Amino acid sequence: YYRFNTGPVGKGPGCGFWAAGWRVWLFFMRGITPLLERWLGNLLARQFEGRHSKGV
RNA sequence: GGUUUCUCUUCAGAUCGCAUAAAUCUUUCGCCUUUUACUAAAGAUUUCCGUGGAGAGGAACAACCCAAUUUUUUGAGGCCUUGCAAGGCU
Ligand SMILES: O=P(O)(O)O[C@H]1[C@H](OP(=O)(O)O)[C@@H](OP(=O)(O)O)[C@H](OP(=O)(O)O)[C@@H](OP(=O)(O)O)[C@H]1OP(=O)(O)O
Numbered sequence: 001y002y003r004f005n006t007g008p009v010g011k012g013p014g015c016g017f018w019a020a021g022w023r024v025w026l027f028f029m030r031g032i033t034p035l036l037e038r039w040l041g042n043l044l045a046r047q048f049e050g051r052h053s054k055g056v
Numbered sequence: 057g058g059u060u061u062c063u064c065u066u067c068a069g070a071u072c073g074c075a076u077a078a079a080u081c082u083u084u085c086g087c088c089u090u091u092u093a094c095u096a097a098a099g100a101u102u103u104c105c106g107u108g109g110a111g112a113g114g115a116a117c118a119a120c121c122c123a124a125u126u127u128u129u130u131g132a133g134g135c136c137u138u139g140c141a142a143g144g145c146u
Contacts, residue, residue: 023075026105027075027076027077027105028077028078029077029105030076030077030078030104030105030106031076031079031103031104031105032077032078032104033077033078033104033105034077034078034079034103034104034105035078035079035103035104037104038079038103
């Protein structure tokens with residue numbers, strides 16, 4: 001923002017340089033995909049196989 | 057003999073990747089009723105999004121000029137004495 005809004009360009013809602021913000025989430029998603037595949041596999045296993053009686 | 061393009065196997069040393077996530081455990085910290093979810097540094101171990109080398113199979117596109125000094129175009133041949141060799145010669 002401070003680099004975009006310089007000179008004649010004033011403060012206001014028009015900056016559209018979206019690569020940086022987009023990039024950060026993509027890296028978040030790289031980490032959270034394994035986690036959710038494991039967690040959601042447990043949710044589905046508990047839904048279809050049933051609750052498992054002996055436990056851990 | 058080539059190039060491009062898919063699948064599989066194997067080995068990864070290289071900033072394996074001029075980029076960068078998550079989880080588990082152990083130490084120390086911050087939160088302060090308990091547990092999720094957490095705060096932030098160190099170390100260890102995994103997962104995940106990508107990469108490189110090698111090999112095998114399939115498919116597609118192209119093709120079976122120096123003879124005149126310093127070297128290589130000659131100072132080249134002939135005589136005498138001693139035990140071919142040495143020397144004196146022309
Ligand atoms: O200049 P703008 O494009 O209008 O941006 C504004 C403004 O930015 P600046 O004043 O820094 O130029 C706000 O800043 P404050 O007025 O609060 O100081 C900022 O707030 P943040 O600095 O917290 O981002 C606000 O963001 P938001 O609308 O989320 O409050 C943001 O507007 P946008 O970022 O939404 O364009």
